[PDB]
Write a protein that binds this ligand. Structure first.
Ligand SMILES: O=C1CC[C@H](N2Cc3cc(CNC(=O)C(F)(F)c4ccc(Cl)cc4)ccc3C2=O)C(=O)N1
Ligand SMILES: [Zn+2]
Lengths: 1106, 382, 196
């Protein structure tokens, strides 16, 4: 099997943050590391500059300035022990990051320490200290000629090291750290010999420190020394001086992160584990000029933040709060305590999907393309996120205004549009635009008692209006009617269209051709058509200086789209379409200098052809469905190219790269539109539906839009019950062991603030309470919150129909968790039903074990209980009776099924295949593969290949094809992200790729996986090896080394996968590098030398799956 | 309640005068290919850390051992998977740590004490013209996995993963689980599930069952490394050969510890293997009379190795003859051959104290080969 | 403790000297002793252990011993010196535990062979054999066997040619071990159990 992995949403969590002068010594930079991404901002009273992609998981990131360098330099160390030193270079308009030194600092032997990689840089900028493995201390000298990052180790007597830091104010490279031996926790200092290469006894040491000493902060000059943080005490250490405080305001939670505010070292920031924010304050006294002695240490609570991972003060009192549990914050902290309490105020809020514990795909906007709803965050940062693929719209003004059946912009004075004409049912009005304020005006020469079918500026400084009965032509200089056209028998006009010089209206089955001359409309031709006309267009296409020689038609009964020639009306091409629905709108436009004809049907079908202007031939037809309601086709311009807006129930913007891209628009419904370009709303769009006129600008390319639904409690699982238009979500909130019965909540959450709240039992330290939440698919209000039993843990959730019961139930598998019993001895399976506005508890099943997962298996419910898989049948008496039973060796943690297969896994990579045999009412082991390793989630790709994520952020694929029960190891790939859930589905409309599987991540990254044919995998593998020679890698990390399947014990090359990110970067290199990449390639189309546009058409076909 | 001295049986004092002892240790590199000789008559699945005594009589066996005592002292013990399976695929190395060749009666006899060292996969078997076989083997590595939280730990909480040593308790383990597995809320599973795959927690759960059998101090007797611990418990589990093979095929201590805990809980009854339908003893009567545990391998005067599980009470057994102290594996106790009352198959021996001050005054020694573990209410290793 | 010295060979020199390996107890100069088969008293003169002379000597060493007493030859190998208090058992019939190690067919009662017990060598006949015993278990056989083949253990009664000095195992090791022998081949080895 050969597969394709592509990132669809870059990671959002923040591994770390640091400030410095990296772009220019005059600038102040903010550097954020979103796992395998590096974001470089510039601070103002934030400005994006450059974001780059490391071929590694960023583990250590620090800024520093070597002896004789213009600006600060950046040091990066990846989880695979890649070290590099980076400089910022700007040649004018081309931002590039050049690598100065690089090298792998991995040691052939060693046990990685428990506290993880710790990187430090001495203040003299002479060395780089790293604590990679236990009992050792790798050191890199920072000589000018160390372009290989040659480093050496230094043995350590202390094995269990907590945290280390380079000391300020020492003429020798001095480190200071906390360690733990069986005698307790202590603190020591060492001095490093860069030449003699050993440790010399340091200044001071003070054994028997606080029991929970965890954080070491080096205080710069003049203070010097270090600060020690713990659960109980904040202590100072410099020489024989020993200051120690124990403020009770921090004994309630643990300090996790810190940051220096002022470079002197008097004000420090303290980040809590629950989101609190503290400011440490050091009291100085300047005895004389020179010496500065430390008097006391004070700490104040400043307010609540997002649960912070990294913190950095910026300037003018603003602080960046980088988080991995919730959204990242930009906070301004004042000196005045706010009315609610403390002195913190949020400014901006950066979206963050991590962590993703579960997610499901849903067709929320009726049918069509899928949307993705995740359980994101933890604790008070708990939230649901709704992610849709489409184009955004920046609403500049919304006006309640029903009945709008037409929309046209108008230039009342010769430039830029200034007037908007609105056609209602059998009537017409005119709006005038003075700035951003809209007011009703009248337009002399325009008739305001008829339904307008078209109006707009035309040639010879004139206007026009095509009502149901007339074709009025208005002047601009005095602004009044100059020539009116009607039907000879004064009959009503059916359909009309116009450009700037020609006008072609139609009446019943007859159509007329008019030209726009000064003060005149010269009628020309009037051919009769076989059947009633539906829509026509006279767009001037291309090349022609003003007027078009073609006329596109759609006819009733015949249901034939036709191209006629002007003014002869000679049938240049007839095309018969479906035959049950009449056409509703037609349009001729051109994309990327290619000439297409479009035509929409009343049922929402959309045909697009290829047009030969001189020949009138409509060929290479292709059809796509956009919505159930009728469609209207309109042309507009954005980014100096002409797009096509398709108004309907599912609005769609058509653009383009010689491949039409139908992109959903993030809007409810749009019936009519027109491009507006005014003095107050420039280069914008005017939208109109049944009740609203909306004006605003539109983005250029479709991204991912994310709607946050905060829950203020940790969500756990999620499923979609469509027949009720609601979501079922498992959640857990934290309460505290209180007086009397206890269990008083912390804060108002989504389970305490539900509409109707149920429970499972009355009252007849931290403690977790689990809930089943019912959430409306449209409002996202908590409709109901079921609270499970005391000491009950909700593990699984699934919404399905069972047996021959038409009711769709919510099924939840639980497990009783008492702290004295290690393995849970009993759990339950509950079957809820959400009818109207109630949650009826339909049935229960007391089970002697946990229920780690469930799945709907061919109308029957299949559940896992410890090491047992049990199949349940749904009775006619509304109960669960057992049909089968199957024991295993493995704890049946993971459960996925396709057809009659069943794939069972556990936390130990162990995988089982099971098959339902109806003629026996039992199961049979089909295959297995045991290779002990930590596994986070699995999924079934097809009947023979199975995907999973193992330890060290990897992926793998097993394959079926006696000893035909062995699963082979056919796919490996180091994704660099902790996959946490797989689910089928896509985020694009309904063939190089086969299948589609999305997945979430702890870092919030959303990726996709699909299968490929051997022909493409062979070619695209050649594509990879060709791009690796060309594309400049940050830190000079080998791509093959990055994607190599990694464990602590083994490291094999990746196979059976394709880094789609690398393949997609083929469209970002310059044009010569493309021709450089295609150095004599054998491309196949039924073989020759391949070009650059040969692979662009290939890669663009791959970018259209996410 | 007892006073025997659990250190006596492990010494195998019945073998006689102190043997020559070796201090050196030989360990082969992981995945390396090695050719190691196989002893023709050894019928056992040896697990690493288990002591194996042997009495070799045949000159071909004696000659091969004299050469081995001069080289690496390591022989291969093939683990036979099936009864009629000619080819062996797995096995365990045995390192001779004590030996003695004696010309007593007039026949050269060689007594040896070996210990299981490294597991291997059999690649080839070559029989020499002498009957001693050589095994081309691949040393199977011991797969050590990191903490389950290592790939899902927050760098800010790294300095919190170290805990100060525990007091020699119920409240402490609750705080251990909460702190080590705090970052479990970033995954699909709760803390209590990760606890089920934590070596330290699993080892503390096993100790709770080993303590029910012996008043042994956890501090020393039981090793602290899960690898060594997992193998030590497997050696004293009274399971059949098919189950013992499955445990040896397990490369992870975690998988081994969980599978052992499930065996210790599921299989409570021990029936006669020949009958299958005759209860002999129960797990409630199992107790450890040797530092190795309730079951250890011992050699009879003719070199037959018996893994003998010591139990307080047994039923449905008839005693043939009178007690004897000759070659007693538990010095101070006399043995009486015990056969099954139904099928008359030899199940083991009853041990009766020779001195009135000894406690227990009587117990039964059952040979693992004769017993079959049964689940109340084929056993499957979880 | 008790003393046992299986006599290997005597030779007339000085008064009278005797050879053997001294297996039980210590032997002092002039320590009165006895000779078991004929109950002859005898007093020590000279203890020439190794080539050196020592007044007393402990078990293990290889002693030449000058004997003062009514012993001037007419002492055969397979006699023993004995502590006069608890001296050695004797006779000519005894039970023993005999493992057959080499024999092409079957041995049955009335089988004639040689019997090597310490220094003594005297022809022997197995009068009747009592009970087989299984090697795996230790199970004393239910019925009397009519014969025993190779690689098999049993307990049997044995009559030597005439009056020899036997000692049961458990009581004494070196004198309680023996090897049946025929055609120079070693055919069985045996520990002695009872004394008939
Ligand atoms: O605690 C225990 C429980 C009992 C267990 N035993 C003793 C035993 C003795 C014999 C028959 N003896 C002999 O065969 C002999 F050893 F007594 C012998 C006699 C003469 C000669 Cl020449 C050589 C050996 C057969 C089998 C066993 C057996 O399985 C054990 O070993 N220690
Ligand atoms: Zn039986």
């Amino acid at each position: 099997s050969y597969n394709y992995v592509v990132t669809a949403q870059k990671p959002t969590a923040v591994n770390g943050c640091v400030t410095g002068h990296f772009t220019s010594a005059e600038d102040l930079n903010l550097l954020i590391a979103k796992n395998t991404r590096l974001e470089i901002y510039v601070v103002t009273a934030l400005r994006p500059v450059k974001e780059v992609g490391m071929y590694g998981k960023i583990a250590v990131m620090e800024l520093f300035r070597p002896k004789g360098e213009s600006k600060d330099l950046l040091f990066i160390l990846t989880a695979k022990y890649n070290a590099c030193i980076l400089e910022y270079k700007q040649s004018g308009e081309s931002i590039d990051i050049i690598t100065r030194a690089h090298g792998n600092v991995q040691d052939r032997i060693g046990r990685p320490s428990e506290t993880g990689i710790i990187g430090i840089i001495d203040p003299e900028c002479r060395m780089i200290g790293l604590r990679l493995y236990d009992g050792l201390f790798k050191v890199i000298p920072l000589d000018r000629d160390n372009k290989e990052l040659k480093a050496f180790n230094i043995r350590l007597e202390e094995l269990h090291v907590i945290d280390v830091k380079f000391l300020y104010g020492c003429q020798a490279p001095t480190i200071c750290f906390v360690y733990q031996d069986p005698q307790g926790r202590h603190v020591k200092t060492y001095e490093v010999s860069l030449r003699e290469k050993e440790f010399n006894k340091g200044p001071w040491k003070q054994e028997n420190v606080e029991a929970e000493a965890s954080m070491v902060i080096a205080v710069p000059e003049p203070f010097g020394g270090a600060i020690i943080i713990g659960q109980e005490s904040i202590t100072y250490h410099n020489g024989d001086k020993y200051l120690a405080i124990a403020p009770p305001i921090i004994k309630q939670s643990t300090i996790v992160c810190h940051n220096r505010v002022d470079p002197n070292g008097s004000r420090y920031l303290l980040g809590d584990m629950e989101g609190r924010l503290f400011m440490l304050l050091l009291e100085k006294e300047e005895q004389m000029d020179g010496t500065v002695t430390l008097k006391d240490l004070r700490v104040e609570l400043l307010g609540e933040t997002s649960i912070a991972e990294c913190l950095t003060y910026l300037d003018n009192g603003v602080v960046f709060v980088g988080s991995r549990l919730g959204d990242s914050q930009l906070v301004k902290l004042n000196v005045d305590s706010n009315e609610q309490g403390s002195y913190v105020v949020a400014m901006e809020t950066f979206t963050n999907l991590g962590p993703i514990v579960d997610m499901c795909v849903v067709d929320l906007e009726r049918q069509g393309q899928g949307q993705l709803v995740t359980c994101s965050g933890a604790f008070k940062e708990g939230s649901l996120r709704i992610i849709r693929n489409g184009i955004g719209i920046h609403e500049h003004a919304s006006i309640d205004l029903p009945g709008i059946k037409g929309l046209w912009p108008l230039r009342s004075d010769p430039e830029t549009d200034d007037t908007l004409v609105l056609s209602f049912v059998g009537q017409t009005r005119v709006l005038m635009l003075n700035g951003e304020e809209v007011e009703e005006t009248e337009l002399m020469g325009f008739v305001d008692d008829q339904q307008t079918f078209f109006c707009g500026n035309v040639a010879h400084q004139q206007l026009i209006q095509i009502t149901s009965a007339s074709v009025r032509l208005v002047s601009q200089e005095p602004k009044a009617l100059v020539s009116e056209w009607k039907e000879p028998q004064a009959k009503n006009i059916s359909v009309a269209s116009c450009n700037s010089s020609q006008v072609v209206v139609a009446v019943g089955r007859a159509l007329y051709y008019l030209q726009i001359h000064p003060q005149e409309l010269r009628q020309i031709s009037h051919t009769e058509m076989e059947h009633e006309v539906a829509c026509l267009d006279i767009t001037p296409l291309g090349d022609s200086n003003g007027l078009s020689p073609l006329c596109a038609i759609g006819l009733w009964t015949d249901i034939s789209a036709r191209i006629l020639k002007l003014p002869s009306f000679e049938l240049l091409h007839k095309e018969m379409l479906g035959g049950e629905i009449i056409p509703r709108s037609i349009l001729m436009t051109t994309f990327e200098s290619s000439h297409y004809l479009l035509c929409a049907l009343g049922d929402g079908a959309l045909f697009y052809f290829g047009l030969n202007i001189e020949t009138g031939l409509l060929s290479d037809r292709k059809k796509v469905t956009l919505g159930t309601q009728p469609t209207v086709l309109r042309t507009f311009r954005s980014l100096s190219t002409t797009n096509v807006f398709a108004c309907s129930d599912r609005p769609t913007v058509i653009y383009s790269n010689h491949k039409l891209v139908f992109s959903n628009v993030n809007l409810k419904e749009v019936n009519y539109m027109c491009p507006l370009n005014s003095d107050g709303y420039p280069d914008s769009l005017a939208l109109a539906n049944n009740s609203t006129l909306t004006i605003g600008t539109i983005d250029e390319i479709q991204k991912l839009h994310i709607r946050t639904v905060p829950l203020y409690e940790s969500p756990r699982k999620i499923c979609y019950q469509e027949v009720s238009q609601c979501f079922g979500v498992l959640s857990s909130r934290i309460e505290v062991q209180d007086t009397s019965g206890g269990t008083t909540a912390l804060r108002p959450s989504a389970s305490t603030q539900a509409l109707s709240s149920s429970v499972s039992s009355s009252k007849l330290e931290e403690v977790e309470v689990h809930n089943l939440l019912i959430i409306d698919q449209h409002t996202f209000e908590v409709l109901h919150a079921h609270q499970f039993l005391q000491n009950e843990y909700a593990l699984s959730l699934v919404s399905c129909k069972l047996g021959k019961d038409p009711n769709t139930y919510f099924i939840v598998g639980t497990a009783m968790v008492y702290p004295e019993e290690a393995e849970p001895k009993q759990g339950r399976i509950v079957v809820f039903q959400y009818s109207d506005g109630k949650l009826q508890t339909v049935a229960e099943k007391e089970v002697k074990g946990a229920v780690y997962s469930m799945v709907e298996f061919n109308g029957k419910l299949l559940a896992s209980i410890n090491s047992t898989v049990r199949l349940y049948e749904w009775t006619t008496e509304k109960e669960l009776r057992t049909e089968c039973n199957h024991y295993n060796n493995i704890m049946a943690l993971y459960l996925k099924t396709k057809g009659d297969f069943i794939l069972v896994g556990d936390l130990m990579r162990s995988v089982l295949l099971l098959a339902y045999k109806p003629m026996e009412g039992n199961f049979e082991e089909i295959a297995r593969d045991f290779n002990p390793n930590w596994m986070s989630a699995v999924e079934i790709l097809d009947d023979d290949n199975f995907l999973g994520a193992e330890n060290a952020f990897n992926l793998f694929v097993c394959q079926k094809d006696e000893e035909r029960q062995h699963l082979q190891e056919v796919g490996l790939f180091h994704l660099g992200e902790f996959v946490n859930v797989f689910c089928h589905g896509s985020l694009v409309m309904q063939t190089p790729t086969q299948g589609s599987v999305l997945f979430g991540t702890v870092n919030g990254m959303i990726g996709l996986v699909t299968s490929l044919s051997e022909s493409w995998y062979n070619l695209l593998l050649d594509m990879q090896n060709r791009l690796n020679k060309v594309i400049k890698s940050v830190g000079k990390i080998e791509h093959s080394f990055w994607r190599s399947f990694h464990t602590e014990r083994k490291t094999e090359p990746a196979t059976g996968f394709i880094d789609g990110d690398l393949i997609e970067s083929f469209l970002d290199i310059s044009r010569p590098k493309m021709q450089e990449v295609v150095a004599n390639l054998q491309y196949d189309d039924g073989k020759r030398e391949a070009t650059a546009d040969d692979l662009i058409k290939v890669v663009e076909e791959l970018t259209r799956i996410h | 309640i007892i006073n025997f001295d659990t250190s006596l049986p492990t010494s195998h004092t019945y073998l006689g005068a102190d043997m020559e002892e070796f201090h050196g240790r030989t360990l082969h590199d992981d995945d390396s290919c090695q050719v190691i000789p196989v002893l023709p008559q050894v019928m056992m699945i040896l697990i690493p850390g288990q002591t194996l005594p042997l009495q070799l009589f045949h000159p071909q066996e004696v000659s091969m051992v004299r050469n081995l005592i001069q080289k690496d002292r390591t022989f291969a013990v093939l683990a036979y998977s099936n009864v009629q399976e000619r080819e062996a695929q797995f096995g365990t190395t045995a390192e001779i740590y004590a030996y003695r060749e004696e010309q007593d009666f007039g026949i050269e006899i060689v007594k040896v004490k070996a210990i299981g060292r490294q597991r291997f996969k059999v690649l080839e078997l070559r029989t020499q013209s002498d009957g001693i076989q050589q095994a081309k083997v691949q040393i199977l590595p011991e797969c050590v996995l990191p903490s389950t939280m290592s790939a899902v730990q927050l760098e800010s909480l790294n300095k919190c993963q170290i805990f100060p040593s525990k007091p020699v308790s119920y409240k402490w383990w609750q705080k251990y689980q909460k702190r080590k597995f705090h970052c479990a809320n970033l995954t699909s599973w709760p803390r209590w599930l990760y606890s089920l795959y934590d070596a330290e927690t699993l080892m503390d759960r096993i100790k709770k069952q080993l303590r029910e059998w012996d008043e042994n101090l956890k501090d020393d007797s039981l090793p602290s490394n899960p690898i060594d611990f997992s193998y030590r418990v497997a050696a004293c589990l009274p399971i059949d050969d098919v189950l013992r093979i499955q445990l040896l095929k397990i490369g992870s201590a975690i998988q081994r510890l969980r599978c052992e805990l499930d065996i210790m809980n599921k299989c409570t009854s021990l029936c006669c293997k020949q009958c299958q339908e005759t209860e002999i003893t129960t797990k409630n009567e199992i107790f450890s009379l040797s530092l190795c545990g309730p079951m250890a391998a011992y050699v009879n005067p003719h070199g037959y190795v018996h893994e003998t599980l010591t139990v307080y009470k047994a039923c449905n057994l008839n005693l043939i003859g009178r007690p004897s102290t000759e070659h007693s594996w538990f010095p101070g106790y006399a043995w009486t051959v015990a056969q099954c009352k139904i099928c008359a198959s030899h199940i083991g021996w009853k041990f009766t104290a020779t001195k009135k001050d000894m406690s227990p005054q009587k117990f039964w020694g059952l040979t693992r080969s004769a017993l079959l573990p049964t689940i109340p209410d084929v056993i499957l290793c979880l | 403790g008790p003393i046992r010295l299986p006599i290997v060979d005597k030779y007339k020199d000085m008064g009278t000297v005797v050879l053997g390996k001294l297996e039980s107890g210590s032997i002092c100069k002039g320590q009165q002793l006895v000779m078991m088969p004929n109950k002859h008293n005898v007093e020590v003169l000279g203890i020439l252990s190794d080539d050196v002379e020592t007044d007393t000597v402990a078990p293990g060493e290889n002693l030449k011993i000058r004997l003062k007493g009514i012993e001037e030859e007419e002492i055969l190998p397979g006699f023993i010196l004995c502590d006069p208090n608890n001296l050695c058992h004797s006779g000519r019939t005894f039970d023993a535990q005999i493992v057959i190690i080499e024999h092409k067919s079957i041995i049955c009662p009335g089988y004639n062979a040689v019997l090597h017990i310490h220094t003594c060598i005297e022809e022997v006949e197995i009068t009747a054999l009592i009970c087989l015993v299984d090697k795996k278990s230790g199970e004393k056989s239910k019925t009397r066997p009519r014969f025993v083949k190779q690689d098999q253990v049993c307990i049997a009664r044995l009559r030597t040619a005439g009056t020899i000095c036997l000692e049961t195992f458990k009581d004494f090791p070196q004198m309680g071990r023996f090897t049946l022998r025929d055609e120079g081949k070693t055919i069985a080895i045996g520990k002695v159990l009872k004394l008939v």
